[PDB]
Amino acid sequence: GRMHAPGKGISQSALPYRRTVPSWLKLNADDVKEQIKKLGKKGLTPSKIGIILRDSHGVAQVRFVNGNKILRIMKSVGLKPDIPEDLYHMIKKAVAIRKHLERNRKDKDGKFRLILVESRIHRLARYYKTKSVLPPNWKYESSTASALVA
């Protein structure tokens, strides 16, 4: 495991058995359907949208109170933007490569790390190219790394 790495390490969540509890939660799936209309309209990513509901209210799992995945909860009220979220963190992480290595070169350890997220785009973006979540003839270009994220 751990593709770009030597480690065998493993870190994740741990979902419980049942799919309805919290049943003691007086909160429904409907006010959180407004909360994504309230909070997710402020530009937040689908991961961190799902982290503010856990700590604050706190609903343990929105998959138990509502059936749809949260991008569909973005979409069914119209909050799915043009760009998928996780590469949008990578390309921002990719654009910080062309901010550190534009002037401070010789960092061939850092210049190793460009080859990761370019590959970690191009293997990853090939998957989303197929799934019709962004069209083909979408080619990542080097000058586009600034404006895709900004």
Binding site: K42, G43, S146, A147, A150
Partner: protein
């Protein structure tokens, strides 16, 4: 300047309204319908001077964007340069009360 102040603009592009140029900024500066004005450090010096004298009368607040016009012009989804900008309507973003 910071990366975090750039994210405050990052929700204006989905929500808020815009004025790009001296002329589009100074037009709403005359009516005072703008709130926040942006100045990048490579602004020409009298242009770096002239905008903020309005702010002493229009009672608005400006910022010294520590980047360049090439990045600020691309920090807003465009590709052409940005030397000045006034966001006349903060749609959803949090520059309504935040200082740097």
């Amino acid at each position: 300047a910071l990366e975090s102040t750039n994210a405050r603009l990052a929700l204006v592009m989905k929500s808020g309204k815009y004025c790009l140029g001296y002329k589009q900024t100074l037009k709403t500066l005359r009516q005072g319908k703008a709130k926040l004005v942006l100045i990048a450090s490579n602004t020409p010096a009298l242009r770096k001077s002239e905008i903020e004298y309005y702010a002493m009368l229009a009672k608005t607040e400006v910022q010294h964007y520590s980047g360049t016009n090439i990045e600020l012009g691309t920090a807003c989804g465009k590709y052409f340069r940005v030397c000045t900008l006034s966001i006349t309507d903060p749609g959803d973003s949090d520059i309504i009360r935040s200082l740097e």
